[PDB]
Design a protein around this motif. Structure first.
Motif, PDB file in Angstrom:
ATOM      1  N   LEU A 152      41.627   3.485 -26.880  1.00 14.09           N
ATOM      2  CA  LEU A 152      40.490   3.960 -26.204  1.00 14.09           C
ATOM      3  C   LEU A 152      40.104   5.336 -26.652  1.00 14.09           C
ATOM      4  O   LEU A 152      40.720   6.143 -26.732  1.00 14.09           O
ATOM      5  N   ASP A 153      38.548   5.325 -26.335  1.00 18.11           N
ATOM      6  CA  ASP A 153      37.922   6.824 -27.077  1.00 18.11           C
ATOM      7  C   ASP A 153      38.805   7.601 -25.979  1.00 18.11           C
ATOM      8  O   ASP A 153      38.749   8.812 -26.110  1.00 18.11           O
ATOM      9  N   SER A 154      38.839   7.506 -24.578  1.00 20.71           N
ATOM     10  CA  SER A 154      39.398   8.239 -23.413  1.00 20.71           C
ATOM     11  C   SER A 154      40.314   7.511 -22.615  1.00 20.71           C
ATOM     12  O   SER A 154      39.702   5.950 -22.534  1.00 20.71           O
ATOM     13  N   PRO A 155      41.499   7.813 -22.015  1.00 22.09           N
ATOM     14  CA  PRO A 155      42.278   6.988 -21.487  1.00 22.09           C
ATOM     15  C   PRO A 155      41.761   6.749 -20.150  1.00 22.09           C
ATOM     16  O   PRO A 155      42.685   6.950 -19.225  1.00 22.09           O
ATOM     17  N   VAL A 156      40.797   6.121 -19.973  1.00 23.16           N
ATOM     18  CA  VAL A 156      40.192   5.933 -18.724  1.00 23.16           C
ATOM     19  C   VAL A 156      39.432   4.527 -18.379  1.00 23.16           C
ATOM     20  O   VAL A 156      39.225   3.946 -19.440  1.00 23.16           O
ATOM     21  N   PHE A 157      39.475   4.074 -17.310  1.00 22.15           N
ATOM     22  CA  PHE A 157      38.334   3.242 -16.901  1.00 22.15           C
ATOM     23  C   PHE A 157      37.750   3.394 -15.882  1.00 22.15           C
ATOM     24  O   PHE A 157      38.190   4.460 -14.893  1.00 22.15           O
ATOM     25  N   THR A 158      36.637   2.962 -15.437  1.00 24.47           N
ATOM     26  CA  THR A 158      35.620   3.189 -14.128  1.00 24.47           C
ATOM     27  C   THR A 158      35.263   1.968 -13.505  1.00 24.47           C
ATOM     28  O   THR A 158      35.008   0.909 -14.059  1.00 24.47           O
ATOM     29  N   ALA A 159      35.179   2.014 -12.279  1.00 29.35           N
ATOM     30  CA  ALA A 159      34.741   1.001 -11.254  1.00 29.35           C
ATOM     31  C   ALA A 159      33.464   1.319 -10.634  1.00 29.35           C
ATOM     32  O   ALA A 159      33.313   2.471 -10.101  1.00 29.35           O
ATOM     33  N   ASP A 160      32.475   0.723 -10.825  1.00 33.45           N
ATOM     34  CA  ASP A 160      31.153   0.869 -10.398  1.00 33.45           C
ATOM     35  C   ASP A 160      30.706  -0.260  -9.702  1.00 33.45           C
ATOM     36  O   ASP A 160      29.865  -1.165 -10.211  1.00 33.45           O
ATOM     37  N   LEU A 161      31.272  -0.412  -8.412  1.00 32.84           N
ATOM     38  CA  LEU A 161      31.018  -1.654  -7.484  1.00 32.84           C
ATOM     39  C   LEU A 161      29.605  -1.619  -7.031  1.00 32.84           C
ATOM     40  O   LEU A 161      29.368  -0.826  -6.471  1.00 32.84           O
ATOM     41  N   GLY A 162      28.799  -2.819  -6.824  1.00 29.53           N
ATOM     42  CA  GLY A 162      27.613  -2.768  -6.216  1.00 29.53           C
ATOM     43  C   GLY A 162      27.634  -3.452  -4.687  1.00 29.53           C
ATOM     44  O   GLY A 162      28.653  -4.124  -4.232  1.00 29.53           O
ATOM     45  N   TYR A 163      26.745  -2.943  -4.075  1.00 29.21           N
ATOM     46  CA  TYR A 163      26.661  -3.431  -2.541  1.00 29.21           C
ATOM     47  C   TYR A 163      25.608  -4.818  -2.838  1.00 29.21           C
ATOM     48  O   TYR A 163      24.426  -4.604  -3.116  1.00 29.21           O
ATOM     49  N   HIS A 164      26.087  -5.862  -2.658  1.00 29.05           N
ATOM     50  CA  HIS A 164      25.301  -7.100  -2.537  1.00 29.05           C
ATOM     51  C   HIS A 164      24.509  -6.956  -3.854  1.00 29.05           C
ATOM     52  O   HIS A 164      23.505  -7.731  -4.000  1.00 29.05           O
ATOM     53  N   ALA A 165      25.355  -6.761  -4.904  1.00 30.58           N
ATOM     54  CA  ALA A 165      24.767  -6.825  -6.332  1.00 30.58           C
ATOM     55  C   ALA A 165      25.663  -6.687  -7.372  1.00 30.58           C
ATOM     56  O   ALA A 165      26.657  -6.079  -6.831  1.00 30.58           O
ATOM     57  N   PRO A 166      25.532  -7.014  -8.631  1.00 29.81           N
ATOM     58  CA  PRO A 166      26.466  -6.703  -9.595  1.00 29.81           C
ATOM     59  C   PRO A 166      26.635  -5.230 -10.060  1.00 29.81           C
ATOM     60  O   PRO A 166      26.132  -4.336  -9.564  1.00 29.81           O
ATOM     61  N   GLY A 167      27.739  -5.034 -10.586  1.00 28.21           N
ATOM     62  CA  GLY A 167      28.184  -3.678 -10.991  1.00 28.21           C
ATOM     63  C   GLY A 167      28.942  -3.788 -12.506  1.00 28.21           C
ATOM     64  O   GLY A 167      28.594  -4.626 -12.960  1.00 28.21           O
ATOM     65  N   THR A 168      29.743  -2.804 -12.483  1.00 28.86           N
ATOM     66  CA  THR A 168      30.168  -2.630 -14.006  1.00 28.86           C
ATOM     67  C   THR A 168      31.547  -2.027 -13.913  1.00 28.86           C
ATOM     68  O   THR A 168      31.909  -1.074 -13.118  1.00 28.86           O
ATOM     69  N   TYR A 169      32.551  -2.447 -14.846  1.00 35.42           N
ATOM     70  CA  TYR A 169      33.854  -1.916 -15.307  1.00 35.42           C
ATOM     71  C   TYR A 169      33.586  -1.412 -16.657  1.00 35.42           C
ATOM     72  O   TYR A 169      33.340  -2.348 -17.427  1.00 35.42           O
ATOM     73  N   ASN A 170      33.885  -0.170 -16.954  1.00 34.80           N
ATOM     74  CA  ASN A 170      33.995   0.420 -18.300  1.00 34.80           C
ATOM     75  C   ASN A 170      35.307   0.845 -18.627  1.00 34.80           C
ATOM     76  O   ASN A 170      35.939   1.140 -17.703  1.00 34.80           O
ATOM     77  N   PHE A 171      35.697   0.684 -19.806  1.00 34.27           N
ATOM     78  CA  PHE A 171      36.823   0.981 -20.209  1.00 34.27           C
ATOM     79  C   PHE A 171      36.856   1.939 -21.378  1.00 34.27           C
ATOM     80  O   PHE A 171      35.876   1.765 -22.496  1.00 34.27           O
ATOM     81  N   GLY A 172      37.459   3.382 -21.445  1.00 36.45           N
ATOM     82  CA  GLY A 172      37.298   4.207 -22.525  1.00 36.45           C
ATOM     83  C   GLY A 172      36.241   5.293 -22.655  1.00 36.45           C
ATOM     84  O   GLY A 172      36.099   6.265 -23.280  1.00 36.45           O
ATOM     85  N   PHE A 173      35.322   5.124 -21.544  1.00 34.01           N
ATOM     86  CA  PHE A 173      34.203   6.205 -21.652  1.00 34.01           C
ATOM     87  C   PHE A 173      33.730   6.378 -20.126  1.00 34.01           C
ATOM     88  O   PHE A 173      33.966   5.592 -19.226  1.00 34.01           O
ATOM     89  N   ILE A 174      33.003   7.444 -19.785  1.00 34.26           N
ATOM     90  CA  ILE A 174      32.359   7.709 -18.560  1.00 34.26           C
ATOM     91  C   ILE A 174      30.868   7.560 -18.805  1.00 34.26           C
ATOM     92  O   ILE A 174      30.624   8.359 -19.444  1.00 34.26           O
ATOM     93  N   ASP A 175      30.226   6.647 -18.200  1.00 26.41           N
ATOM     94  CA  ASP A 175      28.749   6.632 -18.320  1.00 26.41           C
ATOM     95  C   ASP A 175      28.210   7.710 -17.440  1.00 26.41           C
ATOM     96  O   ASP A 175      28.114   7.379 -16.123  1.00 26.41           O
TER      97      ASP A 175
END
Length: 330
Positions: A152-175
């Motif tokens: 990974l570019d950076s040793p991280v993952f992020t959780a961006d969960l939606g309320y009653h909506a889709p969201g995103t899991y990213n690996f290797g970077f912070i958006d």
């Protein structure tokens, strides 16, 4: 490298979130529940007891040219909600949102408990806690994140969960476009294998902030927010007619209520959970009693910052040599 995948609520209550995962060659896409509170990647499969499969998509290792039996390996897991599953193990190629791991342990279920069978939308779990919790025996296996980390570019993952909506899991970077203000980082203990941290306190609605240390885990695989009984009582006391129901299994409130927000501290920063996030709807179809999204952790033995809390934030799971957690508003 990096990966980015959309995660989608399974139902109108955000009971869980599913993320598509490619397994094998040619790819078999299964919708997995990404779970930062466990460390096994397991799937419904062609080996799962037929009567325990009801609508799920299955992994068939015999159709994957890159699948290899991990000889002698078995697994068996029990979750905090009393559900369980077990089986044997293959290694195969696994990709999430464009990020590929070769040789990932894919745990094939031979048996699953009723709650899994009954949920047609979840094809398995992808654990994102620390690999020390992985249940494979006799040779413990690494999580997808642990395997990917070095690439990974950076040793991280992020959780961006939606309320009653889709969201995103990213690996290797912070958006940096996915949150407002700054990310506040806080220390993690890995001693129990979880993303365990200490919140600095809470507020109910527009009330004053109470500075108090609350140790708990950031757990994307738990629906609700489970906190000490004192905190939970203080919250529900602000909702007319709310009460703890032993028969239902927690706090319920009149569906006619307007719920107050709940704030939790991350260092000197504050994450506000809107009241609507705390509504889990009628206890049974047509009931005017609604189930609360903040419940007591008493008798769980640990506080759990589940989806109710996490979906109010952009959350960084920093897997650097000394792991940390970051939270931003969004």
């Amino acid at each position: 490298s990096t990966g980015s995948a959309t995660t989608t609520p399974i139902d109108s209550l955000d009971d869980a979130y599913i993320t598509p995962v490619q397994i094998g060659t040619p790819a078999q896409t299964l919708n997995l529940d990404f779970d930062t509170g466990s460390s096994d990647l397991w799937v419904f499969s062609s080996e799962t007891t037929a009567s325990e499969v009801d609508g799920q998509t299955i992994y068939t290792p015999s159709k994957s040219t890159t699948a290899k039996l991990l000889s002698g390996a078995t697994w068996s897991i029990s979750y905090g909600d009393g559900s369980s599953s077990s089986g044997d193990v293959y290694t195969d190629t696994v990709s999430v949102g464009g990020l590929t791991v070769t040789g990932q342990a894919v745990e094939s279920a031979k048996k699953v408990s009723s709650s899994f069978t009954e949920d047609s939308t979840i094809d398995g779990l992808l654990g994102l806690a620390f690999s020390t919790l992985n249940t494979v025996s006799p040779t413990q296996q690494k999580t997808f994140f642990d395997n990917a980390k070095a690439s990974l570019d950076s040793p991280v993952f992020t959780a961006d969960l939606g309320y009653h909506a889709p969201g995103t899991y990213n690996f290797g970077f912070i958006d940096t476009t996915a949150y407002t203000g700054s990310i506040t980082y806080t220390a993690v203990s890995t001693k129990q294998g979880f993303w365990e941290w200490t919140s600095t306190g809470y507020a109910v609605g527009s009330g004053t902030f109470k500075s108090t240390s609350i140790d708990g885990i950031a757990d994307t695989g738990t629906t609700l927010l489970y906190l000490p009984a004192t905190v939970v009582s203080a919250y529900w006391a602000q909702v007319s007619g709310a009460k703890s129901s032993s028969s239902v299994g927690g706090y319920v409130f009149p569906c006619s209520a307007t719920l107050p927000s709940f704030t939790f501290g991350v260092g000197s920063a504050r994450i506000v959970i809107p009241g609507d996030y705390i509504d889990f709807g009628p206890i049974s179809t047509g009931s005017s009693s609604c189930f609360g999204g903040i419940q007591s952790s008493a008798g769980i033995g640990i506080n759990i910052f589940g989806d109710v809390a996490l979906k109010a934030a952009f959350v960084v799971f920093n897997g650097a040599t000394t792991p940390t957690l970051g939270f931003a508003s969004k």
